[PDB]
Design a protein around this ligand. Structure first.
Ligand SMILES: Nc1ncnc2c1ncn2[C@@H]1O[C@H](COP(=O)(O)OP(=O)(O)O)[C@@H](O)[C@H]1O
Ligand SMILES: Nc1ncnc2c1ncn2[C@@H]1O[C@H](COP(=O)(O)OP(=O)(O)O)[C@@H](O)[C@H]1O
Ligand SMILES: [K+]
Ligand SMILES: [Mg+2]
Lengths: 114, 524
């Protein structure tokens, strides 16, 4: 399902995940909180309130979601709003990769501003 | 000096910016999950406080138009603190909401005065609805709940205040002072006490406690300065024949008379103790008259036409026990016909009603407590001084809230009552469309306190607001436990007076701030 609701589905599924350390728990909460960013930004660009729509979508199940073009809810499959699984998986994995690279970076070397 | 003059929207945006600075500093302390603000003091250490008016009274800005905005919105918190003693953060939140919405409506081409009239009409209707929505708060459990909620969910404070209010009575007074230990303690005084000790340590007959104890004495109330013993001979001889102790409450006793008294006390002739008359001036006269009424005696004064030499036993009062320490004198179980006490306290109530300053009113209330009720003192215990100050401020907030809740009743707390009122006033209309817009502005601003409480918890204010608006009755949101339920059943109570006062003062200041067009101030 499109519109950013698949990531909300998985984030709501994974709310029970725990880590071995209080720092690994902060990392797990950081990654799960970032899966709602697409739908929230879509609703923000359309002009509604992201929190109410996100709560309504999380409350639903399956392919329930929000149509941004007509500003109504419904089954995302029936409204014809789809994403291939490869697109979502690739975007999530590459975002996590670059975030991990930037988190463990100790030095940056560049030419002088001259 | 020379001035700077700004017109229209420039003035309004500067003013709103100053309002926003002060409101953003104040609003971080609202609810069970608000935080503390550190205030720098020029003389001393910083103070860490969660009180709205304390934070508001410190804010001053470098820019002059923004400073005007902040100085104007500061009066809401000041006035709410003066009137109710609590509810200043809510008043500031409401004022900021009204100002923001009203400026948005003004920028759309509305007439500011009609918006102000609509806001006034909505607030009047809202106050009537709040009065209709209230319920009495008389049992001790509800008073404990109010004191607990006002002290930032501290059960011990609520229990202590409920016990104090139960013991001291409806006519008594309760004060808060610094303690010496780590635990809060309550000391209640029954009877009349004034802060005057004996004039000579030799009067002490019980060195174990260093206190002068007299059983069934006479009280000689001398409204004059006594230096020569020649005046007291008749009454002293009469009391010596009587065979029971005597107490002198006089303006002062000089060396000769005091020396004669101390010589006689140790010889076993008479049991005499002498203390000073409390107060200075007219209040001293009034309290001597009060002691005369309580003890059933007559004040010996020159201004009425009697002399102390002609005094007899009929002019001397009586008591059951008198205990005098280095600092305080207490008179216990004094003989007096009740009608005199009720009459005196009645008169004192009439000059209570005809009093302007709060100092005079509190002195009169202390007098009424001494004559009829009691006086309770609560000591606050804390390890350091900053902690002591923060806890003492919380205890004072709780005491004020319990007083208000007793005198007017309680409504459901957490911002729910304002939402219920605004839901009830959904069909109110004015004379023209600008007035209807102003009514809508007020009704929308009535939901700001709950939204800020939910923000301070890290939740979503709009989801909770919608869920609470969808319910009926006392249905609300518990921000401490993060659950929905009955506001009354879980003990989240707010006095009606605090809510009404916050709404009134916020509307009064914000309606005027909406109608600005020009601002004149000094130059940088
Ligand atoms: N009518 C719609 N309602 C809600 N979401 C939509 C709709 N149409 C497309 N989307 C979502 O918007 C996203 C498209 O954003 P886009 O600007 O194409 O960014 P990207 O290039 O990263 O895909 C897709 O994830 C799609 O699921
Ligand atoms: N557990 C709770 N759940 C929801 N609301 C609460 C709770 N405890 C207190 N409140 C509300 O929070 C407000 C307390 O804010 P406070 O910091 O006392 O500011 P004020 O100076 O306006 O009283 C009260 O209106 C009260 O109704
Ligand atoms: K506060
Ligand atoms: Mg309070």
């Amino acid at each position: 399902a499109g519109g950013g609701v698949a990531l909300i589905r998985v984030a709501s599924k994974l709310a029970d995940l725990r880590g071995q350390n209080e720092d690994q728990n902060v990392g797990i909460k950081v990654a799960l909180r970032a899966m709602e960013a697409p739908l929230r930004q879509i609703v923000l660009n359309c002009g509604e309130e992201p929190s109410v729509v996100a709560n309504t979508v999380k409350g639903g199940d399956g392919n329930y979601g929000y149509n941004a073009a007509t500003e109504e809810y419904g089954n995302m499959i029936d409204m014809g709003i789809l994403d291939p699984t490869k697109v979502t998986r690739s975007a999530l994995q590459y975002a996590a990769s670059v975030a991990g690279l930037m988190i463990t970076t100790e030095c940056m070397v560049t030419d002088l501003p001259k | 000096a020379a001035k700077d003059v700004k017109f229209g929207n420039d003035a309004r945006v500067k003013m709103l910016r100053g309002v926003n600075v002060l409101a953003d500093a104040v609003k971080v302390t609202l609810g069970p999950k608000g935080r503390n603000v550190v205030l720098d003091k020029s003389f001393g250490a910083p103070t860490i406080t969660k009180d709205g008016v304390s934070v508001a009274r410190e804010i001053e800005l470098e820019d002059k138009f923004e400073n005007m905005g902040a100085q104007m919105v500061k009066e809401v918190a000041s006035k709410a603190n003066d009137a109710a003693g609590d509810g200043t953060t809510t008043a500031t939140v409401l004022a900021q909401a009204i100002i923001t919405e009203g400026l948005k409506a003004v920028a759309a081409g509305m007439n500011p005065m009609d918006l102000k009239r609509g806001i006034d009409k909505a607030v009047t209707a809202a106050v009537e609805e709040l009065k209709a929505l209230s319920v009495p708060c008389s049992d001790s459990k509800a008073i404990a709940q109010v004191g607990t909620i006002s002290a930032n969910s501290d059960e011990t404070v609520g229990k202590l205040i409920a016990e104090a209010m139960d013991k001291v009575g409806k006519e008594g007074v309760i004060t808060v002072e610094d303690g010496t230990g780590l635990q809060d303690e309550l000391d209640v005084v029954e009877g009349m006490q004034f802060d005057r000790g004996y004039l000579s340590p030799y009067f002490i007959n019980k060195p174990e406690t260093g206190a002068v104890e007299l059983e069934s004495p006479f009280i000689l109330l001398a409204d004059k300065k006594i230096s020569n013993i020649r005046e007291m001979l008749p009454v002293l001889e009469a009391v010596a024949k009587a065979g029971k102790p005597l107490l002198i409450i006089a303006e002062d006793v000089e060396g000769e008379a005091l020396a004669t008294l101390v010589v006689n006390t140790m010889r076993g002739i008479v049991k005499v103790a002498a203390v000073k008359a409390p107060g200075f001036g007219d209040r001293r006269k009034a309290m001597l008259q009060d002691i005369a009424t309580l003890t059933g005696g007559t004040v010996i004064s020159e201004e009425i036409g009697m002399e102390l030499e002609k005094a007899t036993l009929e002019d001397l009062g009586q008591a059951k026990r008198v205990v005098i320490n280095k600092d305080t004198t207490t008179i216990i179980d004094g003989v007096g016909e009740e009608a005199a006490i009720q009459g005196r306290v009645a008169q004192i109530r009439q000059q209570i009603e005809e009093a302007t300053s709060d100092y005079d009113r509190e002195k009169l209330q202390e007098r009424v407590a001494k004559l009829a009720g009691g006086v309770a003192v609560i000591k606050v215990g804390a390890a350091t001084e900053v902690e002591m100050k923060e806890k003492k401020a919380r205890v004072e907030d709780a005491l004020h809230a319990t007083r208000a809740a007793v005198e007017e009743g309680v409504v459901a707390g957490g911002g729910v009552a304002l939402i219920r009122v605004a839901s009830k006033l959904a069909d109110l209309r004015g004379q023209n469309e600008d007035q209807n817009v102003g009514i809508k502005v007020a009704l929308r601003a009535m939901e700001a306190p709950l939204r800020q409480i939910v923000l301070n918890c890290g939740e979503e204010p709009s989801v909770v607001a919608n869920t609470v608006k969808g319910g009926d009755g006392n249905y609300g949101y518990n921000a401490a436990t993060e659950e929905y339920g009955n506001m009354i059943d879980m003990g989240i109570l707010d006095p009606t007076k605090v809510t009404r006062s916050a709404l009134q003062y916020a509307a009064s200041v914000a309606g005027l701030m909406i109608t600005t067009e020009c601002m004149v101030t000094d130059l940088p």
